[PDB]
C-alpha cells in the first residue's frame, strides 16, 4: 500500500516501508510505540498516487491504501483536496494525482485505532 522509500518513525528513530519487519514497532496515533503484527510482500504493478499535504510533505500510496479522514476512512482513490487526515492542527490534503506504478507494501499494527504515522511529517494513516 505505501511506496518502499516512504519513511516511517519508530521508537528508535526512522525506518522505511521497505525495511520495517513484523515485530518491529512504529508510532501510533498518540506517538507511542505500536507493534507491527502482519505485512504484505512487496507488490508490483498496483496503481499508484502521490498525496500532497499542507505540512509540505508527500506520500506515494496505492489506490486502495486507507486514510482516516473527517468523513471516515477513505481509500487513496477517493481522497480529495480539502480533506484532512485525523486521529479522532490536523494536516490537510492539498492535492492527489496518479503517478507511475512503484513497488508498495502494507503493514498492520495492533493499537485499537489501527493507525500509524507515516512520512517525514508523521501523518496518521490506516493499516
Ligand atoms: Zn525525528
Ligand atoms: Zn485506481
Ligand atoms: Zn499499511
Numbering used by the authors: 1 to 88, 101 to 139
Which text from the study accompanies this structure?
In M. smegmatis, DnaBi1 lacks a homing endonuclease (HEN) domain and is located in the ATP-binding P-loop, and its sequence and insertion site are evolutionarily conserved in some mycobacteria, including M. leprae. DnaBi1 utilizes a noncanonical mechanism known as class 3 splicing where an internal cysteine (C118), rather than a cysteine or serine at the first position of the intein, performs the initial nucleophilic attack.
The asymmetric unit consisted of five zinc ions and three DnaBi1 molecules (referred to as A, B, and C). The zinc-bound structure of DnaBi1 is nearly identical to that of the apo DnaBi1 (root mean square [RMS] deviation of 0.065). Three other zinc ions bind to each DnaBi1 molecule in identical positions. These three zinc ions are coordinated by sulfur on C118, peptide backbone atoms (N and O) of V119, and the hydroxyl group (OH) of Y128 of each DnaBi1. Consistent with our SDR results obtained using our KD154 sensor in M. smegmatis, as well as our findings using the MIG reporter, zinc inhibition of DnaBi1 splicing was found to occur through direct binding to the initiating nucleophile for protein splicing.
